[PDB]
Structure 1
């Protein structure tokens, strides 16, 4: 089809500000399927048997979304299993790809249900409670063309500083300078590369946003510099909830200036999170956003160059109302002698007060003099928290890139920060799940992304971490961050440390190439990771591959994701050079023809494939991003090919200089 984007408006949509490009309202009949405004809103479309459905960004299941139900409803779940319908992100863009091909973006800020062949195999049904939304229809040559059009109108993706393409580490539990010093020493003295150490909630004073524990960090700026002098940048977490505490300045200011979300009666809503009772900044109120974002100056002025935003669905352990209800019910259960209240009913009530739909109807946002109940705009919360930070960085230092990523998100947030897929338990299934999400995230603007393995208890075995890190080599966010209750030993503490050094070395050897492809893609509103079907649209086998990805225009990745495996099957849609980074520092190469192959990949080997007629630069291993030698890089791949390398200072925003680009020829 001829490229076209049209916007169909229903009712009176809340302005989410997802798009940067203004699309005029289309007046003509809606061009695909059927629209009903009877029971709220529903779009219904009958798919052809061969149709593939792409999109939904951070959502469960596979690259082809057919065959299940997905609900856009920012949610933090304890475990990511196959039946979960909602993850942390609400990314309402889908592309139907087949004989009839088109994209749809449903710009709607509340619970949106995508029944993608779940109820009836041939039926796509997208529904929500109120017909107040904009639907963008995108037409084009194919799915990839449709994605590129969408990427244009949602505005340029967030771009991290180059140090963020290094490796990072963190543990929920690091509290003192001494803990951080031991990690720094463990990596540097064992020559494992690293650029970042993440600080979890224990660095704060009693879990208070925009404080540092003064007992532990009396001289925090000096410690920040101590780490930075060793090319270790500390990246502190910020939470959505601001502790209720008299005399705490962030709390006092929020109360005085009405910057917190309020109950129906205008009192400040209380949600318990890590600090106990908290209030939530009204992320949808521009004045509150400016105030909250400006608080980041507290840490930036101490030498911090990156942040991560958490618990921003927002998470609620319980509300004052929910806790009271639960205690009342517990009292009834305690006194019940007639078998009225079953133990499982008691258990359910306790589970029900966590992230409760009832609580999301108990507080409001103040948006242009109007109070809007939170549930009606729930999916915008994390988005606007991260927007608050991003906009504050632009005011503080317009020309500087800060590392920034968020748990919850909605399209539009992709301009301000990346995302990470969190986890609690260490599962093999996490590897494939995260691989599959990558292209979908890219379709929706989120290019700086990565995942956590889990880390709880002793469940992270050596081989699981090694395979997880070998996927991480390619994801812009690559870190080993372990969750609460972790007893995960450090990379330098596992048996045969050289294997970990090998995998992380591979990341650093690839940084110039990966950074270059990230920059070329971000600056041109293109994808960093692509499904095979976007690159080989005429190959019926290629279009259905879900456990391999194309990266940039030069390579294909295919990580091993099965325990005890010494290799895996791949499909090559053209001739490629199969490359492995070896634990002795060498790079092995084998030419493989188009077709099916089984390739050997040891735990301490990192594989990739270089496409026919392409090459990539590979640096010698270095232990931090600053020390990578990009003057003397070898070119791996096909004789006679060339590669355009993007390289800037990695710090500022001087993107449009011709000097940033140089052609390398093998």
Structure 2
């Protein structure tokens, strides 16, 4: 069993349950580089100058990770600039690819530093404070094989309901029924396809998890039905923090049953987030997990079929301890007359209390009757929150798939939900960031993923949103989302709405193909998006391409990500058909041979490339997933080619039936 994977154990590792496959502890010396326990733990490896390093799932910068530093330490940071070392995810899988090729999974739940050529260009160094971890070494002939080995042992990826392959609209600010009705009307009356509207935190009663503002929604199930009758499914948010409030059932049950994270003295740790003071459910405690997950029944019973989990790093605006320190410092500042306490020292203190490393040392988890300080298992919180929900869905309705995705994650969580790429910005560079994160996430098991289209923070423009949407066409999560106070970002808020209808039409025409590829990849522990080097390993030009991706085994995508651009350069590793969905509803095709090309792609055109000897089915445009006609779709691509289409009811879990597959021949 497991010939190509070995597990090297150091110290007394916390069981993260990342792997579903049990691997015995190897007894020989670590097989690559050098291991040191002199100062905590460190792995050091000298790379060949041609080596490529893949992996790290949701992390900064590019597909080839060489040339910077990455720290796995789930952090709420809304400014994703090139300098940042830590985002929301901790995905500790890397592959060194070159003359010598191997994969490593560092199963460690705390702060883990990947120095990938940052300090010295030839040096890979992975280090942490405590030598209590399992390291899995995965052997293979090439990077792709190694990923496929890893994907097997971590267990099958989460599978969403088919409606989740539609388009979704979201905004931090939708509050009332009139707000949601205006979104519904803005899309439906302009014939723009859409299947989901997300409800952000304002739908709750005073930000209380598992409540609904009954002044705004006096009969919430009727409203959910009003929307669902128009094939619009409401997707509400759930946050990590449970408001401290007398008589609020979730809070009262958590205190009484000791389901919250505690301080050293056993009192319930107070974290201030949106509701003000809150407690955090002890996500690492099975009983607390079951309790918290069960609460989703509150919304499910009202007709809700999907959720998103937010703030689950967990984010902290301040603790009671931090606020007191802050107010004391402020007092000294206010009465200084000697210029001893400067305004930036005050400013620094205010910043310091947010997501404070000290705060993460102030609370504990109850695991196996043992108290574990949170910092030591920090990266497992978001993971276990989403696990709580996922495990509850199986108890609540085991026949049914629910839409579920989370902000923070760790490998293992991919079994229970997807992720969205968090708080990006209305920056052109974030289209590229969205693109590059995709294959890396697929390597670590996270297939259902995407970014806030148009950009979350700051102000978008008509053309940025259109180019963002055109990449979104291909990402399983396709959601336009925007921050409070930003320029309105709904498709109907711009001139010439027909261009938005055109781009989102392309998504819906491609839904049968994209869903089919997702399912075939998920069911077979394979990738939906792949770097070119996985498909064309013998092409030195191909292995270094980072702004094109292969999807399934049929197509390649290459989005435009420059403002004012009317096309872009591409490298084709084999002959392909260059395809564009045109604003008049037609599909243009042009055969292009292997090599470098500049392709013209207008703002309202959606491009893709179909590989030699392949074809894909394309449906006529429909305005919701339910209405897509998959009976005799048109086949686009090469004569003589065939395609195996996976199709099921999109709702239940009857995956292994011959009726789910049909061969289409062009």
Under a length normalisation based on structure 2, what TM-score does the superposition of the two structures give? 0.99
Q: Which residue of 2 aligns with 1:433?
A: 433
Shift, 1:456, TM fit: 6.3
1:502-558 CA-to-partner distances (Å, cap 9, x unmatched) read 000000000000000000000000000000000000000000000000000000000
**8 Å Cα contact 1:105-1:137 kept in structure 2:** yes
Partner Cα separation in structure 1 for residue 490 and residue 607 of structure 2: 24
Q: Aligned Cα RMSD in Å?
A: 1.1
Q: What's the secondary structure of 2:493's corresponding residue?
A: coil
Q: Measured at CA, do residues 225 and 142 of structure 1 come closer, stay the same or move farther in structure 2, by a change above 3 Å?
A: same
For 1:582 and 1:330, locate their aligned partners in 2 and report how far apart those are by CA, in whole Å: 60
Contact 1:89–1:409, Cα closer than 8 Å, also in 2: yes
**What does residue 473 of structure 1 align with?**
473
Closer, same or farther: CA 344–564 of 1 in aligned 2, 3 Å: same
Q: Could you tell me how far apart the structure 2 residues matched to 1:116 and 1:635 are? A: 44
CA displacement at 1:454 relative to structure 2: 6.1
Distance 1:488 1:455, change over 3 A: farther
Q: CA deviation at 1:422?
A: 1.8
The residue aligned with 2:305 is 305
The 2-side partners of 1:601 and 1:76 are apart by 36
Q: In structure 1, what is the Cα distance between the partners aligned to 2:458 and 2:353?
A: 30
Cα displacement (A) at 1:166: 0.1
Aligned to 2:4: 4
**Is the contact between residue 428 and residue 563 of structure 1 (CA under 8 Å) also seen in structure 2?**
yes
- 1:268-301 deviation line (CA, Å, top 9, x unaligned): 0000000000000000000000000000000000
**Alignment correspondent of 1:69:** 69
C-alpha distance in structure 2 between counterparts of 1:550 and 1:116, whole Å: 25
* Secondary structure at the counterpart of residue 171 of structure 1: coil
Find the aligned partners of 1:37 and 1:654 in 2 and give their Cα distance.
49
| CA–CA distance in structure 2, aligned partners of residues 612 and 59 of structure 1 | 33
Summarize deviations over 1:53-74 as a string: whole Å, max 9, x none. Answer: 0000000000000000000000
Q: CA deviation at 1:423?
A: 2.0
User: Offset of 1:490 from its aligned partner?
Assistant: 2.0
Q: Deviations over 1:25-74 (max 9, x none)?
A: 11011100000011000000000000000000000000000000000000
Secondary structure of the structure 1 residue equivalent to 2:456 = coil
User: Is contact 2:312-2:385 (8 Å) kept?
Assistant: yes
Q: Deviations over 1:543-590 (max 9, x none)?
A: 000000000000000000000000000000000000000000000000
Distance 1:458 1:134, change over 3 A: closer
Contact between 1:423 and 1:453, CA under 8 Å: does it hold in 2?
no
Deviating above 3 A after TM superposition, structure 1's stretches of 4 or more consecutive aligned residues are: 453-458
In 1, the alpha carbon distance for the partners of 2:78 and 2:230 equals 36
User: CA 1:457/1:57 → structure 2, altered by over 3 Å: closer, same or farther?
Assistant: closer
Flag the 1:609–1:8 CA change in 2: closer, same or farther, 3 A.
Answer: same
Distance 1:226 1:641 in 2: 44
Provide the aligned length of Structure 1 versus Structure 2: 666
Shift of 1:487: 2.7
Matched position secondary structure for 1:58: coil
Q: Which residue of 2 aligns with 1:322?
A: 322
Given that 2:424 and 2:457 are in contact with CA atoms closer than 8 Å, whether structure 1 keeps it comes out as no
Q: In the alignment, is the contact (CA less than 8 A) between 2:2 and 2:23 conserved in 1?
A: no
Closer, same or farther: CA 101–501 of 1 in aligned 2, 3 Å? same
Identify unmatched segments of 5+ residues in structure 1. Answer: none
1:425 Cα offset (Å): 3.2
For the structure 1 residues 114 and 455, does the alpha-carbon distance in structure 2 shift closer, same or farther, using more than 3 Å as the test? closer
1:475-522 CA deviation, whole Å, 9 max, x = no partner?
000011111222324211201101100000000000000000000000
Question: C-alpha distance in 2, partners of 1:303/1:97?
Answer: 48
Between 333-342 and 56-65, report the one with greater CA deviation.
333-342
Within 2, Cα distance between the matches of 1:84 and 1:246?
40
Residue 97 in 1 paired to residue 97 in 2? yes
TM normalised by structure 1 equals: 0.99
Work out whether residues 106 and 134 of structure 2, in 8 Å CA contact, stay in contact via their aligned partners in 1. Answer: yes
8 Å Cα contact 2:458/2:483 also seen in 1: no
Once the two structures are overlaid, the 10-residue window that deviates more, 482-491 or 597-606, is 482-491
* Structure 1 position 632 matched with structure 2 position 642: no
- CA distance in 2: counterparts of 1:50 and 1:36, whole angstroms: 26
Deviation at 1:3, TM superposition (A): 5.8
Aligned 8 A contact 1:95 1:104 in 2: yes
CA distance in 1, matches of 2:454, 2:18: 31
How big is each residue's C-alpha offset from its partner over 1:72-101, in whole Å with a ceiling of 9 and x where there is no partner?
000111210000000100000000000000
Q: What is the distance in 2 between the residues matched to 1:406 and 1:324?
A: 32
In structure 2, distance between residues paired with 1:455 and 1:122? 35
Q: 1:110 to 1:458 in 2, by over 3 A?
A: closer
Alignment match, 2:551? 551
What do residues 244-269 of structure 1 show as CA deviations (whole Å, max 9, x unaligned)? 00000000000000000000000000
Q: CA deviation at 1:632?
A: 2.2
Partners of 1:402 and 1:458 in 2: CA distance? 31
Paired with 2:195 and 2:2, the residues of 1 have a C-alpha distance of: 46
CA contact (8 A) 2:72 2:90 kept: yes
Contact persistence 1:3–1:140 (CA under 8 A):
no
Q: Distance in 2 between matches of 1:335 and 1:652?
A: 65
**Distance in 1 of aligned mates of 2:656 and 2:514:** 19
- Does the CA contact (< 8 Å) of 2:453 and 2:472 recur in 1? no
